[PDB]
Amino acid sequence: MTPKLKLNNNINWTKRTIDSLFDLKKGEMLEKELITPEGKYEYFNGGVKNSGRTDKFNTFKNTISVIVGGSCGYVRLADKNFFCGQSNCTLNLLDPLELDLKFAYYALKSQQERIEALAFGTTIQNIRISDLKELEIPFTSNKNEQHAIANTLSVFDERLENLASLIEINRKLRDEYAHKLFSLDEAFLSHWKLEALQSQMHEITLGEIFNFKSGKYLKSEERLEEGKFPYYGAGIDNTGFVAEPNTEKDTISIISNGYSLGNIRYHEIPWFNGTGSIALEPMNNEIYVPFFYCALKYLQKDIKERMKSDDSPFLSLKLAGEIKVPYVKSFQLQRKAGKIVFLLDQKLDQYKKELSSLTVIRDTLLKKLFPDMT
Ligand SMILES: [Cl-]
Ligand SMILES: [Cl-]
Incomplete structure (x- = not known):
């Protein structure tokens, strides 16, 4: 004991x-x-x-x-x-x-x-x-010890509960903001000082503002499990890590293969583009990439649904280049609009990471704080 x-x-x-x-x-x-x-x-x-x-x-x-x-x-x-x-x-x-x-x-x-x-x-x-x-x-029967252990495992439980509540609040607000943005809700454009979009926003194809590369492919003997630069290849999360990244930060990727086909992510750090993945590199400095990330996330379900009725195949560089998204030429205006949604995405991402991390820690501490009886 x-x-x-x-x-x-x-x-x-x-x-x-x-x-x-x-x-x-x-x-x-x-x-x-x-x-x-x-x-x-x-x-x-x-x-x-x-x-x-x-x-x-x-x-x-x-x-x-x-x-x-x-x-x-x-x-x-x-x-x-x-x-x-x-x-x-x-x-x-x-x-x-x-x-x-x-x-x-x-x-x-x-x-x-x-x-x-x-x-x-x-x-x-x-x-x-x-x-x-x-x-x-x-x-x-030591009450001080009862309180010490209960206090240690409550702070975890209360944070997890509060995190879940924050995620749900911010998921709905984010969805609302994106929908009001891309549909150009008048009251929303007024409040957020984005009236210029009403006249200026139109459709462009991705191939007009991004260049595409398909993922490269590394053997297990060429990967690490812990590293600095994440390998991305067909799951939504990294399948391990890499020595030299092949793609810069501030980039977008779309999974081209398997069941996670059509999933979109934004890259905050340099990474490795692996086999079932496409990288998007903006063609110039006048592109606020997170605006376009938000636009694609808005359309992600539609893209998946279209790929389904395509053939049941992969997403080619050809098809990806053809994707139509909303567009405004002005960099300052891309950033002003994009940031409203994207700051909530980043907030949600940190919250989900913390929830996942603390769940594991809470399970670890619960086991270690009490005598093992098996
Ligand atoms: Cl989806
Ligand atoms: Cl039974």
């Missing part, structure tokens, strides 16, 4: 049954006519996600639950009032003074695989309540 990450010295860790720490109650049957997509509360039954919404609740926020039918073993700490269903079980603290709520949640959460293992069946899975009660979890 020694955690791999120790916050304090000489902590006495012990095993405790769920029965010795919690009061267990299964949820209730929610009648179908009480389920409405516009309902105030979540219906948490057998899923990790809700099984619907309602205007009824039977469980206050800040109650721990464990799924005992369906996605068995899953541990939740609800931050909103909710409707607990029959495949879900609440675990109420027997003594709040011996045991911190948030610590209790993490102690249970760290043993999630061992709770899952209690289930019978695979396709239809159930946990018996009497088995759940008998499961031992790691415990310490």
Whole structure:
């Protein structure tokens, strides 16, 4: 009973049954006519996600639950009032003074695989309540240590929650801005001082403002897994790294092959253009590349959909050169328009990177902070 990450010295860790720490109650049957997509509360039954919404609740926020039918073993700490269903079980603290709520949640959460293992069946899975009660979890009666561990794993959880909320806010605003931009919404052009676009914006083909190169190809013996300069080749993200980049920063690429065909990205750093990839290099300095990136992202679904009804093939340099995008000649005006959308893209990109990074860190710390019982 020694955690791999120790916050304090000489902590006495012990095993405790769920029965010795919690009061267990299964949820209730929610009648179908009480389920409405516009309902105030979540219906948490057998899923990790809700099984619907309602205007009824039977469980206050800040109650721990464990799924005992369906996605068995899953541990939740609800931050909103909710409707607990029959495949879900609440675990109420027997003594709040011996045991911190948030610590209790993490102690249970760290043993999630061992709770899952209690289930019978695979396709239809159930946990018996009497088995759940008998499961031992790691415990310490040191309150300072309970708070230290709960504090460490809350800051992660609260940031992830806030990040998810930020991504969703900024995804919708970004979509709105792009749509109002490229359709030239009058009220939007007024507010953002882009009235000049009304007269000046027209269609150009990509081949008139960019030059194209298809991706080059490197053997596994010519790649690194950690490097400075990313290799890009047919997945949306880098397949490893490179010694010498072959393409400059401030460039666009489009995947030409496979299932990620027609996906567009902007390059902030020098990179390697690999086999299922096309690079776009602006023909002169008067091109604000991120304007065009935004324009292509706006059209990305349309391009994919067109490539589908093409042959089911690849995107050639010929076809890519033919892509029509909105265009204004003025550099200052490309930047002024483009920046409104593109600053949200960059914000969203950092948020998604941080969310992905902290998810991994949070999983790592949760495992290391509690004694291993397998
Ligand atoms: Cl089954
Ligand atoms: Cl798409």
